[PDB]
Amino acid sequence: PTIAHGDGRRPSKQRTFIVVKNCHKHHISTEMELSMLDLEILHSIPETPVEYAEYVGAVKTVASALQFGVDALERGLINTVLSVKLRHAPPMFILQTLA
Amino acid sequence: MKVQGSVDRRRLQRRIAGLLPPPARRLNISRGSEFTRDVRGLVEEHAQASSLSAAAVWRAGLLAPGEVAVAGGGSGGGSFSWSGWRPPVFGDFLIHASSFNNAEATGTPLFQFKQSDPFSGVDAVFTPLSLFILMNGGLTRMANLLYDSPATLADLVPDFGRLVADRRFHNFITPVGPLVENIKSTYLNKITTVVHGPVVSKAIPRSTVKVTVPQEAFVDLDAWLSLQPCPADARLYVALTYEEAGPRFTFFQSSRGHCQIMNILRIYYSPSIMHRYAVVQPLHIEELTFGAVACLGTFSATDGWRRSAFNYRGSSLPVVEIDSFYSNVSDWEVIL
Amino acid sequence: MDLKVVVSLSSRLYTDEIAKMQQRIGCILPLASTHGTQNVQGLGLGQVYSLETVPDYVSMYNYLSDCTLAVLDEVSVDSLILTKIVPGQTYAIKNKYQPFFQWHGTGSLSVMPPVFGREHATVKLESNDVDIVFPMVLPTPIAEEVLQKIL
């Protein structure tokens, strides 16, 4: 809106602004390595208890090697969001006299 | 009108249900579940090993229609590939016990040399240190500790003094690969090696198998030369070099590619080419040939070279170790 | 097994050049590193081939063998989706290249730097100020002949 004035100045019309904004994409990738022997003997059943101890060690290994990837993905989330905040952050001395 | 000469309708559903499913990929993970049997479908590498009992073999799936063992009976066999997995081809050799030193690092590459006699039943093979003794760090000392009486090697090659002159010693040797199993007998040792595929232990207590090279023979081609590309596979090469001291045997690793590798071979051996070509030896028609190159196979790039000590009879030698090697022998190419 | 390549653009590409990159759909290009995520600078044959520099085709033809090869699948303003070539996998490929030499089973396909022209094989990206040099692929005897002509 505008405010009328008694002066001879010509009137500014009704003013309309249209602003367009779009998404920005982010891709996040982790790599994990799994040994042959663990993934093989996971399918193998325990015949004797020392093979059962190797089995439980195997499933502990693969469980930790999966938690590593998922936790690193959460760190990817927080790293990308903090980077997006820092990409649109002008410094103080520029912004203060613009305020 | 319902003649139905084709047997397709209501039968072929049952066959397409078996012949259809692809091996799984791109399965999604939810943090709430975080660990399910559906994950374990992809996690399992689905091994091939024996419990020596009939029902357990039916369970494990060694009695598979394909090359690679598939458990599941009729429910098994739908894998339709395993990223192009290949079973390893095994080579069976029968050697005199004097040519082959009984203590061995289980991963050293072997080389077969042919013998002249017709309709034989036995053949020779070699290790690189046997080759160094026959050609004539602490490499020589370690070789002298591993081997005594070179005469027992010298009878196996009755042409060596002539072969090093007629420059034909390289093409008789065909590279084979690392060991898998050794069986000790006093008269005749039983040796089993691996060719063309994964280097895999057949020993039922499972172990990770690595090819080992003596560090004096090996020179890293990538090291002394110079966002470059890195392809996932580098290759290993043998080079057998005719020098005035004698024939010499070396190993090279690079990921560069063949026409590059020939140039880096040439600028590597340029001082030796200068010396051997020098004045000691003028010329003769057979003498022109100088070196031979063969590829031993692809190795995982960025893994690198694992340096370890080799201890025998109270002596140590520095040895490089190579993980996850893939075997693929090529022919011999002449370099000069 | 699941060869998957997605390459992220830092800024959205212009409304003109998205159409040109859609015209380049279904084409082999070599990439730098064998990873699911790649920056656009590693992608394509752009960085070694400069307009300012005198072209060394032997340097290019060395560089391309060092790279692993790939095929473009999906063009968007945000990212480029490409599948990759493993040595032991069989792929469907479509000949969309502008010179159009007829292909037969008689020759193995060989991949060369764009010996013919400079500008038409390449697409500039002023949104992310980098250039994509697509390689030119040709059958075997034409490739042998052109290498002979150059030397």
Place this chain on the structure above:
Amino acid sequence: MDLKVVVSLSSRLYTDEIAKMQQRIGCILPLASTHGTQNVQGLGLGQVYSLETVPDYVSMYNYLSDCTLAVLDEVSVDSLILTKIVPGQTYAIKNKYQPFFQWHGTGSLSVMPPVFGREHATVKLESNDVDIVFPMVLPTPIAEEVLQKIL
């Protein structure tokens, strides 16, 4: 995967022809087409090598370099059962060839175009007015030696 090649014929084979191919039950043939059903005119070297034609070496070598190989499994009345050659697959080969050569473990088998006699190479099928011509298979050192010596 599953490989199958079955060649049917136009006319039934004579009894004499049956034992002729029974002598050659396990051996190698180049196969022109790749489908499971295929006629006799694509399974030999009769298309490239013919009695009326003046035979050539280099066109034959180009054809053997560009073709698909297969190994016979079973010969019956009118049905030929071949199994395809695929890269990265184990096979078993019996050594039935008229010029005789000793084979050894850990050697290199090379297929060369058969240079020796017609009676050394082919089996005539008078039932269907055709011939089958077999690529001479030789170890690679002797494959160099014979070639350079007759040259």
